Amino acid sequence: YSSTLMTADKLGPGGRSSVSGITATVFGANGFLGSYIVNELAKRGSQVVCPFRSTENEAMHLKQMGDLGQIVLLPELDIRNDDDIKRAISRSNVIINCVGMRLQTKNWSFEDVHVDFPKRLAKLAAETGQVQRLIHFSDMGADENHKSLRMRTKAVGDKEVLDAFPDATIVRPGDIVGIEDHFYNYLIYQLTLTVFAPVVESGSNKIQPTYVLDVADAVAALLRKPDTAGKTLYLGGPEVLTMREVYDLLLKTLRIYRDDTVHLPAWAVKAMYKPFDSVRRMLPGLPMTSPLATEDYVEEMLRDKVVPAGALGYADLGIVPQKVTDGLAIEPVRHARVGGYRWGDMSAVAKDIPESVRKYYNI
């Protein structure tokens, strides 16, 4: 149980054909973070079971991630049915929950996804007896006294999970950056493609964004260390930034020479977002609706979302988190700049380059 999870059945040096001994069930495996977690587990020789609700075309990318027989795909998942949850975890000694929601729909509310399903999942996990680890994902700004509904339902579900499954680990990362993220992508869709970009108040609320590969490494580091069972970890990058600094960094990176943002009082932003929030129910959910066009985002922007003092973070897992503002994490937003990424004139350094290279590049 302690460190018998990672040692007792480990066969091979740890590549694609090796065996790690982990059978894991990842809920929400076709999502943004879940795909990276499923890739992290399967590449080391673990069997990963992936139930999903969507069409098979949106889950086909998970089939590549592991050797023959080690990626198991279970379509038509209904999380209101306990039989599907029971079948999906029936051979697993690790359960990882990445199921979450950002907007409400006439079929699904925040309590159904953040409260009721994690409680029933923790109960059915404790019923089996062979599940040695339950990794539940919540947010850094989760709080029971939060005006935003999703943060409050997330904290309530964290309490229910720690109640029903006492050794379950609660993971609370900050904003996650990546190619398919929900943080820079919507901010770039707000800087471009709109007449103006509203900023709540002065934009001085602080955040701690983190990289998706560091969170994927954090899950494996949690599975290694037995002490982290039953704890709560906050995952945040090495830099604390305000939203105005994030907007300035995106405007400098995109090479946009016209600041289209406008600072607005919070009541004005809520008055803008109110007509498309009283009609969010009785509707099956519309494409290209931003998760920033809600009052819950406005309430989140009136507070800090950072790692608390004395909390367990990346350093207790042995991980030095990568920088988010520069390097490989900022390379996808550099592709959306005006004109294209491109190299340059490339002629100052081609002086003492050999003969065929300059003609090959037509310099």
């Binding site: 091979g12 040096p13 990276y36 890739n39 590449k43 590549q64 991630m65 994927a216």
Partner: protein
């Protein structure tokens, strides 16, 4: 540039009697007597051209490969105009483990010949690009597969293997499956090379009889 279409009738013959007799019987002695310093060893064996004849194999030093090939191309009795291939054979038991082999065809007199040079891993062989234009890609492939360096080549670079491929695959001490393998990584979003792992390892079947007499 030979074997122009000259007879407009159907020909029921191959070669003339005197030149075929000379090529099939006297060519080894002729080459040895005319240019003795070029030849170090000769084998007359089972005839590349046909199952019914015999044909010579000439061993030479690398210092005289180019003059011997020029003589074999331009001499009036040995008009070997076509170079069919250049290759190598690895003999790890020898002090010089490589044998570079040149096959030639004479369209003038329906003949063939084989020329060999023995070198180790660090002795260069002179290029035959100026003598034969096909020698370029064959020497590039021989360098790629065996690591034989051909001095004086215009652009000796690998032609067959992968872009970053170090190592010469046709050596006897190189593994059949190699050292690295290739897969797509979802995290790095790139096709990545990794150390080799096999789901089912290769099964080597040792069939060889302890009564068999032909093993050399």
């Amino acid at each position: 540039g030979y074997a122009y279409a000259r007879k407009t009738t159907d020909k029921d013959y191959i070669a003339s009697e005197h030149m075929q007799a000379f090529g099939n019987t006297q060519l080894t002695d002729y080459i040895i007597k005319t240019v003795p310093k070029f030849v170090k060893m000769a084998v007359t064996g089972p005839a590349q051209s046909s199952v019914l004849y015999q044909e010579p194999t000439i061993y030479t030093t690398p210092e005289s490969l180019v003059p011997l090939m020029v003589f074999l191309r331009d001499h009036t009795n040995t008009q070997f105009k076509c170079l069919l291939d250049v290759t190598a054979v690895d003999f790890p038991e020898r002090a010089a483990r490589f044998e570079v082999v040149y096959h030639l065809l004479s369209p003038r007199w329906n003949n063939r010949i084989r020329v060999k040079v023995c070198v180790d891993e660090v002795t260069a062989v002179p290029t035959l690009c100026k003598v034969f234009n096909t020698a370029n890609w064959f020497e590039r492939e021989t360098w790629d597969m065996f690591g034989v360096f051909f001095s004086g080549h215009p652009d000796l670079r690998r032609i067959l293997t992968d872009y970053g491929f170090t190592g010469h695959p046709l050596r006897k001490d190189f593994p059949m499956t190699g050292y690295q393998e290739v897969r797509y990584d979802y995290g790095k979003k790139r096709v990545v090379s990794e150390p080799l792992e096999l789901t089912q390892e290769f099964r080597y079947f040792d069939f060889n009889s302890p009564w068999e007499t032909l093993n050399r």
